[PDB]
Design a protein around this ligand. Structure first.
Ligand SMILES: O=C1C[C@@H](c2ccc(O)cc2)Oc2cc(O)cc(O)c21
Ligand SMILES: O=C1C[C@@H](c2ccc(O)cc2)Oc2cc(O)cc(O)c21
Lengths: 205, 206
């Protein structure tokens, strides 16, 4: 009884450590349960499987940004592209400063395989990125129907180009941090990608 | 017979690919690639010491098709080094869509290959690879610049990083949701977009 609003968050913290150390593919619920100090039944109570745990880690990333995200995906917001700028700067600040964000991103990008003996991992990822895509595409049209935004962006493609650049930059920094002074030059990195979204003719219809 | 060995390196590699693709790199070991290929046992050990070593043989095969256009791009005497960079990326994406082998080895590289302190050598290899790749995009871009094909005050290094990231995330995006990027239909649009960023971003200058 309110036994585990608490153990849920301790099970997720042990999942991160197991996954960060041994990787997702070879970690069993039992490694995690041992690490949390609970039983595999205590885990089954919150999660029906390892894919669900992975999900919980993935989903935990959207929290911090939620507001700037939602803000920028909204007409009434006087200034969409500017919330997208803030959002992006926060995304990079949080990767640099927060060990937790970084670790979960490291697990996501470099320690979580897609194999057909658990395709809910690849499935959940597809769904996550299409979700994120609809988001970027709104933010993109709202900027456009606001003069912030060369009236003929192909949105959908601008959105894909954007996610791609931010995604590959993050994974880049994760591979070689001392080669992307991400914190020091946050603004230049964020702007570079925004300059792509408006200054590039190729992203136009 | 030397020619039999060459035959059996090349079939160790073929089966590693199918092997990593279905079961992933983490839970697949040399033993299992021998049964897959139908091989002899020290054979894979003669050829391939490790697993990191075999993984690296796959990641290495990828560059082969691009050698020519990559070399020209970075040649300080080549008259159209950005044209090389352009057509190189065209061949990269063209081959990605068309060549099943390339697509699978990339899928392995991107989606079936964990970095664990448990090896080190998979991650280490990879850092080197990307640092190497980086080196070349810098020269290339630095050649396009001498020659007034890209903005004169461009930061070559930060531009090379921007470009690598875009091409890497774009490739990964397609492997994940291929029906969301007409990579083969639009190839020139995708190459073009990334290249626009290099020539038009003022944040990439100074
Ligand atoms: O909505 C987001 C958050 C961001 C992100 C979330 C988590 C993470 O680990 C890394 C990046 O990805 C993005 C990438 C973009 O191009 C545009 C965006 O609006 C976003
Ligand atoms: O030389 C290469 C190899 C290429 C590549 C892409 C995908 C892949 O799976 C393997 C290699 O990436 C590049 C990206 C560039 O901007 C410039 C380049 O010169 C290169």
């Amino acid at each position: 009884k309110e036994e585990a609003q608490e153990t849920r968050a301790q099970i997720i913290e042990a999942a991160e450590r197991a996954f960060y150390k041994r990787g997702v593919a070879r970690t069993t619920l039992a490694d995690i349960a041992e690490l949390a100090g609970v039983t595999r039944g205590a885990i089954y109570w919150h999660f029906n499987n390892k894919a669900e745990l992975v999900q919980a880690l993935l989903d935990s990333l959207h929290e911090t940004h939620d507001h700037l995200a939602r803000a920028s995906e909204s007409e009434d917001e006087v200034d969409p592209l500017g919330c997208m700028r803030k959002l992006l700067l926060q995304v990079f600040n949080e990767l640099v400063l927060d060990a937790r964000t970084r670790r979960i991103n490291e697990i996501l990008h470099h320690k979580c395989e897609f194999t057909d003996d658990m395709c809910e991992i690849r499935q959940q990822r597809q769904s996550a990125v299409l979700d994120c895509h609809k988001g970027i595409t709104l933010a993109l049209a709202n900027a456009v129907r606001r003069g912030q935004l060369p009236g003929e962006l192909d949105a959908e493609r601008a959105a894909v180009a954007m996610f791609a650049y931010v995604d590959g930059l993050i994974r880049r920094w994760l591979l070689l941090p001392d080669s992307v002074d991400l914190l020091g030059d946050v603004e230049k990195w964020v702007d570079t990608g925004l300059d792509m979204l408006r200054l590039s003719p190729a992203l136009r219809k």
